[PDB]
Design a protein around this ligand. Sequence first.
Ligand code: SPH
Ligand code: SPH
Lengths: 242, 242, 49, 48, 246, 58, 58, 297, 99, 49
Amino acid sequence: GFPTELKPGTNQFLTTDDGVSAPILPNFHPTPCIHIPGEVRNLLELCQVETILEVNNVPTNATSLMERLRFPVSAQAGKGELCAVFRADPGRSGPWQSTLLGQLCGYYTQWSGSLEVTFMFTGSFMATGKMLIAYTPPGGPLPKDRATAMLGTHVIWDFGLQSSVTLVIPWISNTHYRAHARDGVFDYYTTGLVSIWYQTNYVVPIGAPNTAYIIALAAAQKNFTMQLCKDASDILQTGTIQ
Amino acid sequence: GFPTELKPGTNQFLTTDDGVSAPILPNFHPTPCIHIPGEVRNLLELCQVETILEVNNVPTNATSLMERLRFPVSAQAGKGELCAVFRADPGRSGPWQSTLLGQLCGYYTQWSGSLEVTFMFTGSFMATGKMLIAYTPPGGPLPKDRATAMLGTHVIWDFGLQSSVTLVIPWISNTHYRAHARDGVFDYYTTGLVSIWYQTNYVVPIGAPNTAYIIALAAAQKNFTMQLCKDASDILQTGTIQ
Amino acid sequence: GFPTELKPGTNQFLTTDDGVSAPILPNFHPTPCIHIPGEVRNLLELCQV
Amino acid sequence: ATAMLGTHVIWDFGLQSSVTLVIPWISNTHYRAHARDGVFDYYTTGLV
Amino acid sequence: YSDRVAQLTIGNSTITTQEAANIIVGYGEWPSYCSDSDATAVDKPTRPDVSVNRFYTLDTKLWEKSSKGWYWKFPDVLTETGVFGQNAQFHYLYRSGFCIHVQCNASKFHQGALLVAVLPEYVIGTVAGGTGTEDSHPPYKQTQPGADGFELQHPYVLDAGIPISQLTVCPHQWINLRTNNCATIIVPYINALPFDSALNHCNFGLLVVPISPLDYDQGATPVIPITITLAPMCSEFAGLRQAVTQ
Amino acid sequence: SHENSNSATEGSTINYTTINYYKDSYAATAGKQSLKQDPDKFANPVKDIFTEMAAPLK
Amino acid sequence: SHENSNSATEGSTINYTTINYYKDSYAATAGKQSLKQDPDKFANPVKDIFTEMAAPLK
Amino acid sequence: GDRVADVIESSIGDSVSRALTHALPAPTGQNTQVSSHRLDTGKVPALQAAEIGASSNASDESMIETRCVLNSHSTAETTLDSFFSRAGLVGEIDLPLEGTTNPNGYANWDIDITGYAQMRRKVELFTYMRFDAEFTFVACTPTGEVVPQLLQYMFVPPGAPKPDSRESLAWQTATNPSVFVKLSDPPAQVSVPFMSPASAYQWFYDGYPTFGEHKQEKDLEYGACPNNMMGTFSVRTVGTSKSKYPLVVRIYMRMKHVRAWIPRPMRNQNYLFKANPNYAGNSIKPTGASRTAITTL
Amino acid sequence: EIGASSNASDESMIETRCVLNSHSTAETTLDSFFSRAGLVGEIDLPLEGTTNPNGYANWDIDITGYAQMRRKVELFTYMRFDAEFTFVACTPTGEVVPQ
Amino acid sequence: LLQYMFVPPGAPKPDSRESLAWQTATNPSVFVKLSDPPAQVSVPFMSPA
Ligand SMILES: CCCCCCCCCCCCC/C=C/[C@H](O)[C@H](N)CO
Ligand SMILES: CCCCCCCCCCCCC/C=C/[C@H](O)[C@H](N)CO
């Protein structure tokens, strides 16, 4: 027969190897594929779809879980009080873990590109207000006050006919890619911190609520890519199914 | 199936065999290679770079280790006294073992080509002097005196504006290649001996040092090649790391 | 993978078989062959002596 | 260390005796009146 | 035309020298700004030019007759100095090459030779408890000394297991008192990334170390100082934020 | 008539280049794939698109 | 579009001739390499080169 | 005029790195041209200044009367690919029946090339390296015996769930690569691409990975670049009942498509720790052998 | 409110440089995301137990019952694909036996 | 499970069954089981002559 040598690697079963194997059904033909609306071709198509960013984190008491989807914003009787703040890291815990981008990122070790976080104001039409929203790139601590917060990438948001402003947090990294930043030595790949300040005030007329809520939606920009396939950070099983 | 016979050699793992094997990551793309200054493409590029030749050998007392990098040269009150002497063998112990060429040679069993040893004088500008530097090819013993030393390849060095003369020890061998000459029967591949004599004297005016130092740098010429890959002559581990 | 059957004769070591086998030294080049007088090319050259 | 932060020149003693420090025209106005010595410090050129 | 007489003008700084060796261009490659194909950050970087691209005199060590040699870590040397360091603090990303002009001059009746060397990614190790059975690590003041620099524990070993016996591989230049009185090294941005933190990471390390000891008779000058001067070239900063330090 | 055409992705827009040894093409490798995307299908399925520069609600 | 181009040395000056069986080119052999050198990059990175015959310091 | 001139001329933003030197082909060693005697003033090759920082440009043709040599010695053996395509020991994983070490047939190994001096020093010659890899896994008993066991090697990239049990739920391997081999089978071999976020791996990171204050606590993280920390490596038994044999797994790495960049001096002191260039301070050794006097051999 | 994602590009939110992005999107495709062999079934044939004791087990083919492979797949509602099944057999200790 | 290792002139010779030289970072070595057929290797002409 034809002379062959077996190189190391034979009889091994690599779970990700793309080889061929014997077919069970000779001349079987799959039932014709009719048209089905909204076909997915690349996971990046889903990563550009905005989903709720759970910036409010309170498990209390597993009944008020729906509060996790929104900001409390109220008529501060001061100047430039801090509203909210969270990490820009998508694969890190935990606000991004409510987003579809966050979970899809959980199936990939490396990502790259700008991200978008859109904030929708859900107060009354009579309610107005201007607020600063700052993105502070890696390095630097939590901005203690608004004056030393604006020094980074920020956007001034005016409440009006258009509910939502979108803070684009541009791809600012030393590396071409960022591995998940969690949570010690791997802070090297952190994206930074997003903080929300009151630019002026939440101002209300006589017959309208003194407190309103803000909803944050998050997704990836179009220069977004993912590179390395890992298992989901959390496995959902304890202990045997059925 | 297609008739095949298995020749002897199957299932073996040759550590230097250049075959292929299954890929773990389908469609993975390496992050683009940006420009990095000073890329190495061939180890011969590094072998032409001069490094300190440790001709002075004194472990005493592991604090005066920095003396190993230089010659003592002084105002000899005589004629043609011997200054220093060492083996031209690069892979042999031990002066060449401080050079980058020496260690890189330690990863190769066979070499060929001329070598260059450059001597820099580090005395005062007021200090002058002429010195002979002789290369005695294989065969012949240590030259007892200068008169029976010059009979080989030599260069007369004058101290001046240019600090350094370079003694080129040309490729003089019977074989096309030299294996490491160490240290008994393998003296067949010896390159020879380099000796340093005082051609005249180390002459100094009234207010300057009676003793100065010489630094020897060594590298390979451009007709230099290496042929066979061995392990490093010395392994640096005792006994387990971490 | 590509379907193959192993014919009898596999794993055998025939001492006179002229097959190939893995090389220990990637990109090794033999030292150039200089001229040596009186090369033998066939044993019949010696049988006529 | 807090001097070099301005316009400076490193001078090496050698065959050429002299280095020349050019103190370039650095003013807000197109012209400088004499800076002497109180309110007229507005037109000062600086310190060497 | 001559080889030893040189002048280095950058921004509003100017260095003259009459007794020098030729200029070394690092890895045979002139410093350059980052292309749009190497970069990855989408921010439009600041290239402050003249204000930060200029010579800085940061230290002056006294070369005594028995000194082990010193080192500095770049670019941590400037982080608190000038308007360069200001940009390096307010920003996350930084990129620059340097023009190091080490200088040391004596008489003609002095002798000795320095070794100026630029070793990229000069990671420093510790004496492992003297015996080898302690995984200790260097303090901040040793890995990031900054202005004043740091004196070598041991010079033979380069405080990292590597030998100084072969340091002349990476871009170097000798200061031999009988021929030259200054060394000049031009390095480009040497990194696997187009940009880096400048505070956390140190692109390279300047190693000023004598191999042939300084010596002199009972003359009229025993105080021979080595002075370090450097100048950022093609400086770029991106990722603006608040002022952050060490 | 060449070989069998019983791959699951047969007759689709996607252009695959695959390796196969058997007559049935569904036993072939996953192979190299054509990179085409359509984010607007899920990210912007609105009827009357307005420009980026435009105010959406007016 | 031929096969995948995900070798680590992709897009470099070096001209490799390699053997491969899988779609991903990084699983290929080390292969034969192009012999090019540049000693002057490390051995002579001076600005103003002088001739061999010339006196360097003058 | 319009616009300002110091912007028009200004070389700010010059993209291409100005090359002081280009690479020439050198398939063979350099040939040697014939030489004759020369007694002249001004032409002086031998005299040079090491202060400059350059290597001796003096050629042997100008130091001694030379013959003609058509050098055809190949330089192929001295290339980064043919120097690094040598499989070396990079890891030893132990799975004893009962000991201090891992006793449940599941070991985790954070992937560190170092920890084995020979493969380390060879690699530590350069500062930045970029390459694809070919990993080989040799499994046997501590005596070298081959036994009928079934292992599972699993590659756990950074952030992926690490196995905390011999029968952990992470061994489903729905995404991350894993290999199923018998010890009866020859060594498993796998090709691996270059997967750093940087353009190259670093054997040296002269800095800290985190910001803030670096007190004596977080001082051990100095020199830690996560760009060449490619995750952990896990082995199974496989479950569910404990194995019957003592096992040893040795990992071998072969490099291909190699591209190193900047050269580094070569270690002369005993390696003591992983990812850390510490050394014994009282036991400082010379880089090579030593003799009794400089005037003797 | 409209129901669309933010069309605002980073070029109009911050002064940006030029970036020739050549990052591949191949890793993020349905084929290269699902061509990963995962655990979908465990069949037990003990000598004597509560489970199947006669060396014949029947398993109605259900991909679910193993969360990791399930959740990854449950991302989509409709899926159409060819499959490559692998069967690993051993003893509960992992031993290989002549069966 | 044997390990054959080629130790060219000057390379570190093993002085123990578990010597540090068995890392084989450069010099060729072969890993064979006795179960496997005879290991076979091609070798070039490597004399300096
Ligand atoms: C199936 C398992 C495959 C495992 C894949 C691992 C590939 C890792 C490539 C090597 C990365 C560089 C190694 C790390 C460098 C040094 O060990 C230390 N980090 C030095 O600080
Ligand atoms: C030689 C044996 C080959 C066995 C072939 C089985 C192929 C079956 C293809 C998978 C079909 C979809 C799996 C079923 C879906 C879920 O498990 C549940 N039905 C959800 O309701």
